[PDB]
Amino acid sequence: RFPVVNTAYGRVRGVRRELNNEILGPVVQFLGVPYATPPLGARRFQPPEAPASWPGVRNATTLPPACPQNLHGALPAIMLPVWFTDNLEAAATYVQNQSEDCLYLNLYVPTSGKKPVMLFLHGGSYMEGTGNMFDGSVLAAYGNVIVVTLNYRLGVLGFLSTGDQAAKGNYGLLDQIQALRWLSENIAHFGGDPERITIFGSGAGASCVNLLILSHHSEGLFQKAIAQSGTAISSWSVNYQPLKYTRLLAAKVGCDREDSTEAVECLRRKSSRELVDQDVQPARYHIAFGPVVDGDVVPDDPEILMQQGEFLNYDMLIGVNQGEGLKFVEDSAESEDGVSASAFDFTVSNFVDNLYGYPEGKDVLRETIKFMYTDWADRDNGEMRRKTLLALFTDHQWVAPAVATAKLHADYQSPVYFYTFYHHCQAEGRPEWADAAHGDELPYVFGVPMVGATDLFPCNFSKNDVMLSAVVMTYWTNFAKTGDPNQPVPQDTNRFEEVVWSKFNSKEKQYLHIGLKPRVRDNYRANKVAFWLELVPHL
Amino acid sequence: RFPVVNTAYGRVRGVRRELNNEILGPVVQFLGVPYATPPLGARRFQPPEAPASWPGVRNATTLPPACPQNLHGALPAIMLPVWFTDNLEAAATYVQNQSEDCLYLNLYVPTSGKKPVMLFLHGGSYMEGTGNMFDGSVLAAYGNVIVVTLNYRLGVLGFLSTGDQAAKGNYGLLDQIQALRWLSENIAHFGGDPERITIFGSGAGASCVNLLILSHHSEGLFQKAIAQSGTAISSWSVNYQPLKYTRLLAAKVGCDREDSTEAVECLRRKSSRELVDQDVQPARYHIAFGPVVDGDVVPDDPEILMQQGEFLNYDMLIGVNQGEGLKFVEDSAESEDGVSASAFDFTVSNFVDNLYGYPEGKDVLRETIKFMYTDWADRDNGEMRRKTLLALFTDHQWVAPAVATAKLHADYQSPVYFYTFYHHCQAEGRPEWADAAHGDELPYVFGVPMVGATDLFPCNFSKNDVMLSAVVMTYWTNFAKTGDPNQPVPQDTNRFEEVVWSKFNSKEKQYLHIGLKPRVRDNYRANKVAFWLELVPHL
Amino acid sequence: AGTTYIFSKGGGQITYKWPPNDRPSTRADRLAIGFSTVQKEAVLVRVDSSSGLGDYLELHIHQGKIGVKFNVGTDDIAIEESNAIINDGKYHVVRFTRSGGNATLQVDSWPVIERYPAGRQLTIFNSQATIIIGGKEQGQPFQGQLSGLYYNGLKVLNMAAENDANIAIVGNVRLVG
Amino acid sequence: AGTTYIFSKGGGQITYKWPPNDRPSTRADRLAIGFSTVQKEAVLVRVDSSSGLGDYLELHIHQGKIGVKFNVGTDDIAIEESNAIINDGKYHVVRFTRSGGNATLQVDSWPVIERYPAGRQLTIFNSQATIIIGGKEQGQPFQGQLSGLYYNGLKVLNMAAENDANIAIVGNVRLVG
Ligand SMILES: *[C@@H]1O[C@H](CO)[C@@H](O)[C@H](O)[C@H]1NC(C)=O
Ligand SMILES: *[C@@H]1O[C@H](CO)[C@@H](O)[C@H](O)[C@H]1NC(C)=O
Ligand SMILES: *[C@@H]1O[C@H](CO)[C@@H](O)[C@H](O)[C@H]1NC(C)=O
Ligand SMILES: *[C@@H]1O[C@H](CO)[C@@H](O)[C@H](O)[C@H]1NC(C)=O
Ligand SMILES: *[C@@H]1O[C@H](CO)[C@@H](O)[C@H](O)[C@H]1NC(C)=O
Ligand SMILES: *[C@@H]1O[C@H](CO)[C@@H](O)[C@H](O)[C@H]1NC(C)=O
Ligand SMILES: [Ca+2]
Ligand SMILES: [Ca+2]
């Protein structure tokens, strides 16, 4: 049918699309309901407002337009998910209707009371992506939960700031908070539960989730959180010099005033497409436009705030993949042997210069992190140097910040569940030596194996992948239901039945090792994590 | 019988003691044959000369006297073998007839050509020990080799020096070289082969071996060297500040004249008992009286000398044990747990000040060697901090120098065989957590388990101990015979039959893991060895 | 006066122990209590965090003047009704509104005493563990009558009288009526 | 005056390969060889270390002057007999004795020439591998007659005449008689 549900601002008409598979029940999709006023003119570069009531019934059947972006331009290719960089054309297929009016969200209701809600905060980086790429319909049909995927302002229109009061910034975070408010005060009509709202995202979008924890704006909106392959303390999570890039963009676009307010007004006079297409290149392993520490949404740097217990006890599910810096070694990934020492030292030196660059001492730090990240039992392998470089990038950017934030969240008696992903979808262009890369868990979480390969994921999915996906969404939906991945639904079609996930205590850093052969392990890369967290600050 | 042989300086009558075991033949012992004139008067602090011919037949049946030494004094207790300090009162039984004319030696002839000779250099440190303790008669009758032991000047009478030509020093090394010359020119009569002379020793004596290789004086005397648990490049192998300790001793003993010749002449008129019994304290992990770089016996710094290939291509057999710094953790061996957290950064700190003490930087070195030598999966174990402290001392003082010397000797194409000893005799006074300590391989090399427990080794020897002693004795005797541990004699009375001991190439550092489960491994503690050889210099 | 619990000779303590998996944290705190006593020095209401966390809330009468002292992590902030005598033996109600570091105290209908601390102050009360009423363990036992305890949406004496599974009264603290 | 190997048109070379397990390293070197030739520029005796090590000893005739250049590790110390001409067709015998860095070169009965290089110098000739006579592979082919090549108690030419296993003959080397 075409079910109609009345919201607090009007009435919307959904659909009743039935899934390709058999065991999955029908799913009702309200694709394209709005949650804020479209920031088109003077409301641009301002926090969003509540929507406007409409008379009658509004169609919700087609995917809403995406926010303005430039996929075929100059984007940070090191932080984007691998499946998004590989399938760039199939990704740009979705972002074709780009327009400044994009603040719409899609809900996937399924067909033990009110169903929990799971918001998905997408975004490999802050300059690209849209919510229509992830068909959260298999997940809703499996876990009996309501998946909500939103669209928020990205790039210049959502994160431009000057530090002053003329342009505070963090308009994307405010859009996400407005969407959370809309879900909190409207999901009861759809059968959802406004008291069991989880937020889960991958990549830098997960960073938003973390940045949505240290903000007093989102106090009672959501109860849990699932941050996978993302943190608020990595190098590319927040922007610390927003004026240096805002002035650069203003100068390149045509008007660079010395007054913040008039420059902001001049930018507001520009079109939404002219300033998106403009190329502003940030420093390596950083971001140009992103969340900015101002005092309203992000009171201070996320490292300081989360150390002194500035959060309100959200159940948390953190995790990382095994090797995520697959694009760190990409200039030397198509050779018979790996990286020669003359190039390994060059890459490590460039790494140190770009990230640390501390003038106090660098001839000591470079040597010690060269010595640590090499296996002396097989020193002259060459081929197994790409592995150590990949491990270096994965450990510094993803594993260490994730472990640090898990320890900090678990030091204030808030539940933390740590996971590590090893299995990956067997693609065509993915190298055999490489392992599960950045964002290589999204197909499994969303039920792509149980619905068949799509344009974004062209891999051949066997029965092993189907079982792993079923187990992964079982864990995620159990966490959404109660906050413990083991209690609601016992594991069923295997080595997944007898493994019990345990919390992440700081003293005993227990975690679960999701993969072909699961196990509740005791410490993940304790040597390198301790190196990056406890030794490098002393050098 | 009571055999008599005609040496170049006369005739000596020997005894024919028969060994207790039923698998060993008779052994002819010639004990006390002199090899140099007795340095009592003006010959003190002078290099030795050849002996004087004696008419008639000399009775060589009783053990010769030992050199002067103050056992109940301030001996360096770190470098001494464990069994020596444990049975210190029993060891003093052998050294009771201390006389200044101690320059004697004793041979243990057995009864496929001629017989090889194996000289043994004793001395845990440079101020103690005598050759009568090691009754090398079980080894002689097993491998059909002629085992020779000697006495050389130790301590002040042996290694006193000032720097100039007044007292060059290294008189103990010259006594050892004189003994080697006596064996070279007189061993043919006894039935030995004067061109197959191995020279082996454990502890500081092994250091003498590694200083008899880089020495111009000993060119054609020997051909092979077995240096077990000892190097010439460690901190306590040579003395780089002889003048300070010599002047302090001269002042303490009664005369410190501002001219070196006058002080030396005054010292030459003083009795041995009143200057041996002094108390001269060296800096920690160093020696007061020892070999000195002068230009005659040790041409230059052994670390610099051996990097430029200043050796004459001697076959080599180096070895270490698992944990040899058992006396490093001595203040925390009678505690239920291991060491405290504040007691782990105190021992390491004192280690750093005593050994390195660089003013350029020590807060970088201390932190990195404190981070490296700890188990991060058991960060608060306690016991696995005593273990890591023992491993730290063993790696710095015994394993890294041994690997460096083996690499620098195999770079110039000289057959080097590396071994690591793990099994040990279960003693009474040693801790249960401990492993094979310093000098715990000597009973097996000398066949003590095959003759029964003695006063020096009161341990309980099972069949495994006897089998291991036979195996290591067979390996040593094969090396003495042909320079190849496995060539002449196959293993006999086990997993030792099918293991083939390979060379030690500087690219693939193969070695034999001697123990209850022998197997030719590939790299011994590659991480810590590379840390001490290649990273610490950069800091 | 609501559910009146008396404190007789010898003192006592009533404790609400939060469930281990449902410990709450909040930016803003609310407190209300009607007390009747004559004790010059005592402790009425104490709120503690879990193990290792120094954040606490304390209601204490010093020199006959009731005051609220909270430590949210940075420093202790204490506000007192200095210009009023409360230990006259009558029923006196008090309310305490906490937001960030700012705190307002109201007594009956008397003028409100407000406090706006200067500088950077923390705002989160981290992982509350127990509500302590009586103050005997601290060193200032309370002898009197208490009624109407409201704390951040929780009526402590009400569910204490309702025999909740996580409430324990040790001592001579008796219910009035 | 013993075994004589005569080079012919084109050139020749004699290579002695020490066994891999018995390569000697010596602090003293002796090289005696009798020669007869009229070539102005050539190399007669070349002794090399194993692979990697730069130790070498080279006896060469250049501009009518016979000289030996050896690298023991520090610098190529070369001593040359300059006040004489030897490639006049007459038979000659040359001896070279080396100890440490010090060298002594003698030819026939003329007074010996001594080289005493100054400064700290290395001494040990590490891991001699092969002996090259004629220098066909060195770059200067040698044409003439050679006899009695005595090297540290070893006679290479004498062993060559008895079909030594390690001796290799390549080129136009001919044996007289
Ligand atoms: C959308 O609205 C139009 C307006 O009349 C209606 O005709 C149509 O049925 C609706 N649904 C669609 C197009 O799916
Ligand atoms: C995967 O499927 C595609 C299309 O069915 C096929 O061409 C390919 O050979 C399969 N196997 C792979 C990619 O390993
Ligand atoms: C030598 O020793 C034997 C055996 O003890 C003894 O009989 C003999 O008298 C000794 N002779 C001398 C000269 O000491
Ligand atoms: C050695 O072991 C045997 C048992 O095999 C035992 O009888 C004997 O007492 C032990 N000796 C010592 C000194 O413990
Ligand atoms: C606390 O008082 C300060 C003083 O100006 C004010 O800025 C702040 O907003 C107050 N706190 C809250 C949560 O309003
Ligand atoms: C070479 O001659 C000098 C000067 O006589 C001498 O000092 C040096 O010891 C000699 N070298 C050797 C190796 O004998
Ligand atoms: Ca706090
Ligand atoms: Ca050399």
Side-chain angles (χ1 to χ4, degrees), chain A residues 420-424 435 444 462 464-465 467-468 494-496 513-516 518-519:
Chain A
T420 303
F421 213 72
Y422 271 43
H423 200 3
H424 69 144
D435 206 331
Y444 300 94
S462 57
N464 239 333
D465 288 4
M467 167 271 298
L468 186 59
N494 205 347
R495 324 141 207 82
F496 273 138
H513 175 277
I514 299 186
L516 276 308
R519 175 145 137 74

PDB file of all heavy atoms in Angstrom, chain A residues 420-424 435 444 462-465 467-468 494-496 513-519, unseen atoms left out:
ATOM      1  N   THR A 420      36.839  -5.050  16.725  1.00  0.00           N
ATOM      2  CA  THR A 420      37.820  -4.975  15.654  1.00  0.00           C
ATOM      3  C   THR A 420      37.348  -5.848  14.502  1.00  0.00           C
ATOM      4  O   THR A 420      36.968  -7.006  14.705  1.00  0.00           O
ATOM      5  CB  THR A 420      39.204  -5.419  16.132  1.00  0.00           C
ATOM      6  OG1 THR A 420      39.604  -4.604  17.239  1.00  0.00           O
ATOM      7  CG2 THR A 420      40.218  -5.264  15.019  1.00  0.00           C
ATOM      8  N   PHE A 421      37.372  -5.287  13.299  1.00  0.00           N
ATOM      9  CA  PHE A 421      36.870  -5.937  12.098  1.00  0.00           C
ATOM     10  C   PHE A 421      38.045  -6.402  11.252  1.00  0.00           C
ATOM     11  O   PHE A 421      38.955  -5.619  10.964  1.00  0.00           O
ATOM     12  CB  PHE A 421      35.983  -4.980  11.299  1.00  0.00           C
ATOM     13  CG  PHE A 421      34.856  -5.654  10.575  1.00  0.00           C
ATOM     14  CD1 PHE A 421      33.771  -6.155  11.272  1.00  0.00           C
ATOM     15  CD2 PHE A 421      34.875  -5.778   9.199  1.00  0.00           C
ATOM     16  CE1 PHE A 421      32.732  -6.772  10.610  1.00  0.00           C
ATOM     17  CE2 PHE A 421      33.838  -6.394   8.531  1.00  0.00           C
ATOM     18  CZ  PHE A 421      32.766  -6.893   9.238  1.00  0.00           C
ATOM     19  N   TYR A 422      38.025  -7.673  10.860  1.00  0.00           N
ATOM     20  CA  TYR A 422      39.073  -8.255  10.029  1.00  0.00           C
ATOM     21  C   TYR A 422      38.592  -8.669   8.649  1.00  0.00           C
ATOM     22  O   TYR A 422      39.311  -8.469   7.669  1.00  0.00           O
ATOM     23  CB  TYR A 422      39.692  -9.471  10.725  1.00  0.00           C
ATOM     24  CG  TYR A 422      40.864  -9.136  11.618  1.00  0.00           C
ATOM     25  CD1 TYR A 422      40.828  -8.039  12.464  1.00  0.00           C
ATOM     26  CD2 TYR A 422      42.015  -9.911  11.602  1.00  0.00           C
ATOM     27  CE1 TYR A 422      41.900  -7.731  13.277  1.00  0.00           C
ATOM     28  CE2 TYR A 422      43.091  -9.608  12.411  1.00  0.00           C
ATOM     29  CZ  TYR A 422      43.028  -8.517  13.247  1.00  0.00           C
ATOM     30  OH  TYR A 422      44.096  -8.209  14.058  1.00  0.00           O
ATOM     31  N   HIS A 423      37.399  -9.246   8.545  1.00  0.00           N
ATOM     32  CA  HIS A 423      36.872  -9.659   7.253  1.00  0.00           C
ATOM     33  C   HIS A 423      36.558  -8.443   6.389  1.00  0.00           C
ATOM     34  O   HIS A 423      36.306  -7.344   6.889  1.00  0.00           O
ATOM     35  CB  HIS A 423      35.614 -10.505   7.443  1.00  0.00           C
ATOM     36  CG  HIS A 423      35.272 -11.364   6.266  1.00  0.00           C
ATOM     37  ND1 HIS A 423      36.058 -11.432   5.136  1.00  0.00           N
ATOM     38  CD2 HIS A 423      34.225 -12.192   6.043  1.00  0.00           C
ATOM     39  CE1 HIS A 423      35.511 -12.264   4.269  1.00  0.00           C
ATOM     40  NE2 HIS A 423      34.397 -12.740   4.795  1.00  0.00           N
ATOM     41  N   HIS A 424      36.581  -8.647   5.073  1.00  0.00           N
ATOM     42  CA  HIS A 424      36.285  -7.589   4.121  1.00  0.00           C
ATOM     43  C   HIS A 424      35.637  -8.193   2.884  1.00  0.00           C
ATOM     44  O   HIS A 424      35.770  -9.387   2.606  1.00  0.00           O
ATOM     45  CB  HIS A 424      37.546  -6.813   3.724  1.00  0.00           C
ATOM     46  CG  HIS A 424      38.508  -7.605   2.895  1.00  0.00           C
ATOM     47  ND1 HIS A 424      39.256  -7.042   1.883  1.00  0.00           N
ATOM     48  CD2 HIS A 424      38.847  -8.915   2.929  1.00  0.00           C
ATOM     49  CE1 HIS A 424      40.013  -7.972   1.329  1.00  0.00           C
ATOM     50  NE2 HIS A 424      39.784  -9.118   1.945  1.00  0.00           N
ATOM     51  N   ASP A 435      44.148  -5.811   3.639  1.00  0.00           N
ATOM     52  CA  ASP A 435      43.091  -6.363   4.473  1.00  0.00           C
ATOM     53  C   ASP A 435      42.008  -5.299   4.667  1.00  0.00           C
ATOM     54  O   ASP A 435      42.025  -4.249   4.019  1.00  0.00           O
ATOM     55  CB  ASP A 435      43.673  -6.875   5.791  1.00  0.00           C
ATOM     56  CG  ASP A 435      42.836  -7.978   6.400  1.00  0.00           C
ATOM     57  OD1 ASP A 435      41.610  -7.986   6.171  1.00  0.00           O
ATOM     58  OD2 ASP A 435      43.408  -8.860   7.071  1.00  0.00           O
ATOM     59  N   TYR A 444      28.365  -4.763   5.557  1.00  0.00           N
ATOM     60  CA  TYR A 444      27.883  -5.799   6.465  1.00  0.00           C
ATOM     61  C   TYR A 444      26.858  -5.247   7.448  1.00  0.00           C
ATOM     62  O   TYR A 444      25.884  -5.930   7.784  1.00  0.00           O
ATOM     63  CB  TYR A 444      29.060  -6.432   7.204  1.00  0.00           C
ATOM     64  CG  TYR A 444      30.065  -7.078   6.280  1.00  0.00           C
ATOM     65  CD1 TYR A 444      31.177  -6.380   5.836  1.00  0.00           C
ATOM     66  CD2 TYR A 444      29.894  -8.382   5.844  1.00  0.00           C
ATOM     67  CE1 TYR A 444      32.093  -6.967   4.989  1.00  0.00           C
ATOM     68  CE2 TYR A 444      30.805  -8.975   4.997  1.00  0.00           C
ATOM     69  CZ  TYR A 444      31.901  -8.263   4.573  1.00  0.00           C
ATOM     70  OH  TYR A 444      32.810  -8.853   3.728  1.00  0.00           O
ATOM     71  N   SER A 462      29.653 -14.232  -0.740  1.00  0.00           N
ATOM     72  CA  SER A 462      29.392 -15.651  -0.554  1.00  0.00           C
ATOM     73  C   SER A 462      28.486 -15.857   0.658  1.00  0.00           C
ATOM     74  O   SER A 462      27.960 -14.906   1.241  1.00  0.00           O
ATOM     75  CB  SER A 462      30.707 -16.414  -0.418  1.00  0.00           C
ATOM     76  OG  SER A 462      31.487 -15.898   0.647  1.00  0.00           O
ATOM     77  N   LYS A 463      28.288 -17.120   1.047  1.00  0.00           N
ATOM     78  CA  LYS A 463      27.481 -17.415   2.226  1.00  0.00           C
ATOM     79  C   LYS A 463      28.185 -16.985   3.507  1.00  0.00           C
ATOM     80  O   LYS A 463      27.521 -16.634   4.492  1.00  0.00           O
ATOM     81  CB  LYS A 463      27.149 -18.906   2.276  1.00  0.00           C
ATOM     82  N   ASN A 464      29.519 -17.014   3.513  1.00  0.00           N
ATOM     83  CA  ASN A 464      30.272 -16.536   4.667  1.00  0.00           C
ATOM     84  C   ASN A 464      29.961 -15.071   4.947  1.00  0.00           C
ATOM     85  O   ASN A 464      29.739 -14.675   6.098  1.00  0.00           O
ATOM     86  CB  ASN A 464      31.770 -16.730   4.423  1.00  0.00           C
ATOM     87  CG  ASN A 464      32.422 -17.619   5.459  1.00  0.00           C
ATOM     88  OD1 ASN A 464      31.967 -17.705   6.598  1.00  0.00           O
ATOM     89  ND2 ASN A 464      33.503 -18.285   5.070  1.00  0.00           N
ATOM     90  N   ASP A 465      29.930 -14.252   3.894  1.00  0.00           N
ATOM     91  CA  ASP A 465      29.614 -12.838   4.062  1.00  0.00           C
ATOM     92  C   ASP A 465      28.180 -12.647   4.532  1.00  0.00           C
ATOM     93  O   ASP A 465      27.901 -11.753   5.336  1.00  0.00           O
ATOM     94  CB  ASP A 465      29.858 -12.088   2.754  1.00  0.00           C
ATOM     95  CG  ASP A 465      31.332 -11.944   2.434  1.00  0.00           C
ATOM     96  OD1 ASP A 465      32.160 -12.495   3.188  1.00  0.00           O
ATOM     97  OD2 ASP A 465      31.662 -11.281   1.429  1.00  0.00           O
ATOM     98  N   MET A 467      26.403 -14.734   6.421  1.00  0.00           N
ATOM     99  CA  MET A 467      26.363 -15.069   7.842  1.00  0.00           C
ATOM    100  C   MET A 467      27.010 -13.974   8.685  1.00  0.00           C
ATOM    101  O   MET A 467      26.478 -13.593   9.738  1.00  0.00           O
ATOM    102  CB  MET A 467      27.047 -16.416   8.081  1.00  0.00           C
ATOM    103  CG  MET A 467      27.349 -16.734   9.542  1.00  0.00           C
ATOM    104  SD  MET A 467      28.951 -16.140  10.126  1.00  0.00           S
ATOM    105  CE  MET A 467      30.063 -17.059   9.069  1.00  0.00           C
ATOM    106  N   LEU A 468      28.160 -13.459   8.240  1.00  0.00           N
ATOM    107  CA  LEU A 468      28.830 -12.405   8.993  1.00  0.00           C
ATOM    108  C   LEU A 468      27.972 -11.152   9.072  1.00  0.00           C
ATOM    109  O   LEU A 468      27.900 -10.508  10.125  1.00  0.00           O
ATOM    110  CB  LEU A 468      30.182 -12.077   8.368  1.00  0.00           C
ATOM    111  CG  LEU A 468      30.993 -11.086   9.200  1.00  0.00           C
ATOM    112  CD1 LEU A 468      31.238 -11.630  10.596  1.00  0.00           C
ATOM    113  CD2 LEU A 468      32.293 -10.757   8.515  1.00  0.00           C
ATOM    114  N   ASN A 494      28.709 -22.714  13.203  1.00  0.00           N
ATOM    115  CA  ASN A 494      29.064 -21.322  13.452  1.00  0.00           C
ATOM    116  C   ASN A 494      29.815 -21.176  14.771  1.00  0.00           C
ATOM    117  O   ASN A 494      29.536 -21.883  15.739  1.00  0.00           O
ATOM    118  CB  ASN A 494      27.813 -20.441  13.460  1.00  0.00           C
ATOM    119  CG  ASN A 494      28.117 -18.994  13.119  1.00  0.00           C
ATOM    120  OD1 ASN A 494      29.276 -18.579  13.097  1.00  0.00           O
ATOM    121  ND2 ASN A 494      27.073 -18.217  12.854  1.00  0.00           N
ATOM    122  N   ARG A 495      30.776 -20.255  14.799  1.00  0.00           N
ATOM    123  CA  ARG A 495      31.569 -19.980  15.988  1.00  0.00           C
ATOM    124  C   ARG A 495      31.055 -18.780  16.770  1.00  0.00           C
ATOM    125  O   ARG A 495      31.673 -18.390  17.764  1.00  0.00           O
ATOM    126  CB  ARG A 495      33.031 -19.750  15.596  1.00  0.00           C
ATOM    127  CG  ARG A 495      33.494 -20.618  14.437  1.00  0.00           C
ATOM    128  CD  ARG A 495      34.411 -19.843  13.505  1.00  0.00           C
ATOM    129  NE  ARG A 495      34.377 -20.362  12.144  1.00  0.00           N
ATOM    130  CZ  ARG A 495      33.450 -20.049  11.248  1.00  0.00           C
ATOM    131  NH1 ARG A 495      32.460 -19.221  11.540  1.00  0.00           N
ATOM    132  NH2 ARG A 495      33.518 -20.580  10.031  1.00  0.00           N
ATOM    133  N   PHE A 496      29.940 -18.191  16.343  1.00  0.00           N
ATOM    134  CA  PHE A 496      29.417 -16.954  16.907  1.00  0.00           C
ATOM    135  C   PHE A 496      28.464 -17.170  18.074  1.00  0.00           C
ATOM    136  O   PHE A 496      28.035 -16.187  18.688  1.00  0.00           O
ATOM    137  CB  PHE A 496      28.705 -16.159  15.808  1.00  0.00           C
ATOM    138  CG  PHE A 496      29.616 -15.264  15.013  1.00  0.00           C
ATOM    139  CD1 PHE A 496      29.490 -15.176  13.638  1.00  0.00           C
ATOM    140  CD2 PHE A 496      30.623 -14.547  15.631  1.00  0.00           C
ATOM    141  CE1 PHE A 496      30.324 -14.361  12.900  1.00  0.00           C
ATOM    142  CE2 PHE A 496      31.456 -13.724  14.896  1.00  0.00           C
ATOM    143  CZ  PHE A 496      31.311 -13.639  13.530  1.00  0.00           C
ATOM    144  N   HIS A 513      36.794  -9.665  18.659  1.00  0.00           N
ATOM    145  CA  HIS A 513      37.517  -9.677  17.392  1.00  0.00           C
ATOM    146  C   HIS A 513      36.585 -10.235  16.319  1.00  0.00           C
ATOM    147  O   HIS A 513      36.565 -11.438  16.057  1.00  0.00           O
ATOM    148  CB  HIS A 513      38.794 -10.502  17.526  1.00  0.00           C
ATOM    149  CG  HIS A 513      39.545 -10.674  16.244  1.00  0.00           C
ATOM    150  ND1 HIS A 513      39.220 -11.639  15.316  1.00  0.00           N
ATOM    151  CD2 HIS A 513      40.615 -10.014  15.742  1.00  0.00           C
ATOM    152  CE1 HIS A 513      40.052 -11.561  14.293  1.00  0.00           C
ATOM    153  NE2 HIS A 513      40.908 -10.583  14.527  1.00  0.00           N
ATOM    154  N   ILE A 514      35.808  -9.348  15.698  1.00  0.00           N
ATOM    155  CA  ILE A 514      34.861  -9.770  14.673  1.00  0.00           C
ATOM    156  C   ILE A 514      35.620 -10.177  13.419  1.00  0.00           C
ATOM    157  O   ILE A 514      36.522  -9.465  12.960  1.00  0.00           O
ATOM    158  CB  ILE A 514      33.853  -8.652  14.375  1.00  0.00           C
ATOM    159  CG1 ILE A 514      33.047  -8.313  15.627  1.00  0.00           C
ATOM    160  CG2 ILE A 514      32.915  -9.070  13.262  1.00  0.00           C
ATOM    161  CD1 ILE A 514      31.930  -7.331  15.388  1.00  0.00           C
ATOM    162  N   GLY A 515      35.259 -11.326  12.859  1.00  0.00           N
ATOM    163  CA  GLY A 515      35.931 -11.813  11.669  1.00  0.00           C
ATOM    164  C   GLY A 515      35.481 -13.223  11.343  1.00  0.00           C
ATOM    165  O   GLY A 515      34.410 -13.659  11.768  1.00  0.00           O
ATOM    166  N   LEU A 516      36.316 -13.922  10.571  1.00  0.00           N
ATOM    167  CA  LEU A 516      36.020 -15.314  10.242  1.00  0.00           C
ATOM    168  C   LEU A 516      36.027 -16.186  11.491  1.00  0.00           C
ATOM    169  O   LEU A 516      35.163 -17.053  11.657  1.00  0.00           O
ATOM    170  CB  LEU A 516      37.025 -15.843   9.218  1.00  0.00           C
ATOM    171  CG  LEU A 516      36.766 -15.551   7.738  1.00  0.00           C
ATOM    172  CD1 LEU A 516      35.357 -15.973   7.338  1.00  0.00           C
ATOM    173  CD2 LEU A 516      37.021 -14.089   7.402  1.00  0.00           C
ATOM    174  N   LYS A 517      36.996 -15.968  12.382  1.00  0.00           N
ATOM    175  CA  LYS A 517      37.147 -16.735  13.616  1.00  0.00           C
ATOM    176  C   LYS A 517      37.080 -15.770  14.792  1.00  0.00           C
ATOM    177  O   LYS A 517      38.103 -15.196  15.198  1.00  0.00           O
ATOM    178  CB  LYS A 517      38.456 -17.522  13.620  1.00  0.00           C
ATOM    179  N   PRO A 518      35.900 -15.560  15.368  1.00  0.00           N
ATOM    180  CA  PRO A 518      35.767 -14.589  16.457  1.00  0.00           C
ATOM    181  C   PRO A 518      36.453 -15.062  17.728  1.00  0.00           C
ATOM    182  O   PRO A 518      36.721 -16.249  17.924  1.00  0.00           O
ATOM    183  CB  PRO A 518      34.254 -14.501  16.662  1.00  0.00           C
ATOM    184  CG  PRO A 518      33.765 -15.849  16.244  1.00  0.00           C
ATOM    185  CD  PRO A 518      34.629 -16.244  15.080  1.00  0.00           C
ATOM    186  N   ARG A 519      36.722 -14.099  18.608  1.00  0.00           N
ATOM    187  CA  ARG A 519      37.286 -14.395  19.916  1.00  0.00           C
ATOM    188  C   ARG A 519      37.218 -13.137  20.769  1.00  0.00           C
ATOM    189  O   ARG A 519      37.392 -12.026  20.260  1.00  0.00           O
ATOM    190  CB  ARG A 519      38.734 -14.894  19.800  1.00  0.00           C
ATOM    191  CG  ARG A 519      39.449 -15.103  21.124  1.00  0.00           C
ATOM    192  CD  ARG A 519      40.394 -16.297  21.041  1.00  0.00           C
ATOM    193  NE  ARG A 519      41.685 -16.041  21.668  1.00  0.00           N
ATOM    194  CZ  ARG A 519      41.889 -15.990  22.978  1.00  0.00           C
ATOM    195  NH1 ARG A 519      40.905 -16.179  23.841  1.00  0.00           N
ATOM    196  NH2 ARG A 519      43.115 -15.747  23.433  1.00  0.00           N
TER     197      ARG A 519
END
